[PDB]
């Protein structure tokens, strides 16, 4: 390795740095939370009462187990275009709260649901934050929300005094004062009704088709995790270089005993450098202390290459008795 770092067949007498050594992990343990309930995704997607886009409905998910396999593998009608997470990698993570929003969108307006975009419905009907995360789902509803002469019960606004904030609902029945007519409910000319009907048509092709859109708005906040997935819980190993998956907070290290005094509302723990140093066991409510495994530098002490061919490796940074860590044990 001394000849491999600096490119020469002959290496002169001195001390050089070749590489670093680090003990590899040996075991994996997963400890999620204690729950059973199954999440009711068959009541949001398989619903019958989708409202108008200008006034949607806001749902909540509580402590249950959500199987994300049925989301994409079963019933794969249209493309997903998930903005910030992978559907295949969705099973490992688990979150704090899940919100589901549902409304009906025109066929050409499917692409309007995007971070920061603008449009006829992207400003006055539904606005997304720029840092939005989570998948978006859209599919055809040509048989469900459609009438021969057209349905007039689905409304979208056109006029407002200002654009909407992200995740802001602004249902209101009023006339718009435009021009020089001081309308006091008279609703004359240039005093227009801001809510204009859809006017469906089943004989038309793509462009005015009934598409049903549901979105999911995840978040990753340091809190008691509530919804978690189907991975099985395992045992716990003390004083061994292993891998851990405590509540989705992955990493490698050594789990030991702790003497900290956590308050009942305290879960995580950070050091000065803003890095996790103490994690409460979710299924035991005990305190631990995460410490990374041993590491250090390696140096080679040799005389001149043409003089002799014997070396002396200096293992740095580590106590040679407690962690002796192949020239080892010679």
């Amino acid at each position, epitope marked *: 390795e001394t000849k491999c770092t600096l490119k020469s067949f002959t290496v002169e007498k001195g001390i050089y740095q070749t590489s670093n050594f680090r003990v590899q992990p040996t075991e994996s343990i997963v400890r999620f939370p204690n729950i*059973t*309930n*199954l*999440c*009711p995704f*068959h*009541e949001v997607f*398989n*619903a*019958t*009462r989708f409202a108008s886009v200008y006034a949607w409905n806001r*749902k909540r998910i509580s402590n*249950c187990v959500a199987d994300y396999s049925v989301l994409y593998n079963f019933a794969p009608f249209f493309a997903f275009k998930c903005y910030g997470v992978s559907p295949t990698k969705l099973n490992d993570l688990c979150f704090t709260n899940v919100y589901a929003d549902s409304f009906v969108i025109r066929g050409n307006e499917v692409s309007q649901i995007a971070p920061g975009q603008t449009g006829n419905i992207a400003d006055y009907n539904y606005k997304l934050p720029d840092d939005f995360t989570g998948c978006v789902i859209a599919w055809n509803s040509n*048989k*469900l929300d459609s*009438k*021969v002469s057209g349905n007039y019960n689905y409304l979208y606004r056109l006029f407002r005094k200002s654009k909407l904030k992200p995740f802001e609902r602004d249902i209101s029945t009023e006339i718009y004062q435009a021009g020089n007519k001081p309308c006091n409910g008279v609703a004359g000319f240039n005093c227009y009704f801001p809510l204009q009907s859809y006017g469906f048509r089943p004989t038309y092709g793509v462009g005015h088709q009934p598409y049903r859109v549901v979105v999911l708005s995840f978040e990753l906040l340091h809190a008691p995790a509530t919804v978690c997935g189907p991975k099985k819980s395992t045992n716990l190993v003390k004083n061994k270089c292993v891998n851990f998956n405590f509540n989705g907070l992955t990493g490698t290290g050594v789990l030991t005993e702790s003497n900290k005094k956590f308050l009942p509302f305290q879960q995580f723990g950070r050091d000065i450098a803003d890095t996790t140093d103490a994690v409460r066991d979710p299924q035991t409510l005990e305190i631990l202390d995460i410490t990374p495994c041993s590491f250090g530098g390696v140096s080679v002490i040799t005389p001149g290459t043409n003089t002799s061919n014997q070396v002396a490796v200096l293992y740095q940074g580590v106590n040679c008795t407690e962690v002796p860590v192949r020239v080892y044990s010679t």
Partner: antibody
Amino acid sequence: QVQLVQSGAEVKKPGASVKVSCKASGYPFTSYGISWVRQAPGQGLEWMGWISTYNGNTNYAQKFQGRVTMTTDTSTTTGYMELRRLRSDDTAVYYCARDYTRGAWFGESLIGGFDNWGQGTLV
Amino acid sequence: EIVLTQSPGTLSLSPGERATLSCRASQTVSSTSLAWYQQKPGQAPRLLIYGASSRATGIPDRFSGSGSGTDFTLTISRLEPEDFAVYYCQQHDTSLTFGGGTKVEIKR
């Protein structure tokens, strides 16, 4: 793979209280409500009760208000009827079914229905 | 309340040819409220189609349904003789009601 068992068949005097059981297995008893229906010879099927699982919402029919009360226990995964004020013309078979029509969490209307049935209890 | 008009009362038809079942409601209903159940003698109900024509379990070559807005009908081809069940159609939008009656007889 679904198993739905109930109590046996017996005869009750009118005006008494009949204890009806419905034990479920093969599916998680957390996201599907129970529905109690009645079949008698000579006509079709009635619709006494719908009962949620995650909470204790009641959706008893208008014809059985104040008479039918329903309980469910997740410890044994079993539902119980304590149906009192019995009559002489209501001796018929009763089926408990895993329902898919109403919301088991929030209560909205769905698409689907009674996909799992028991064998029934004759009174 | 809402009821449904039931007059496919008699089906004295041979096995094999076209079969169509018609049941109609009192009031206009949505297209997502449709269900149908079969009654073997001394047995238990189970689904045929949970929606308009969306399959539930198997449906080899016979069971079909088609909903024309408010009304809805049943399309069966190659009627094999063994089933001969009692047919029930159910709405979902307002409360819940069940089918009236439909029989197939052996034409002795």
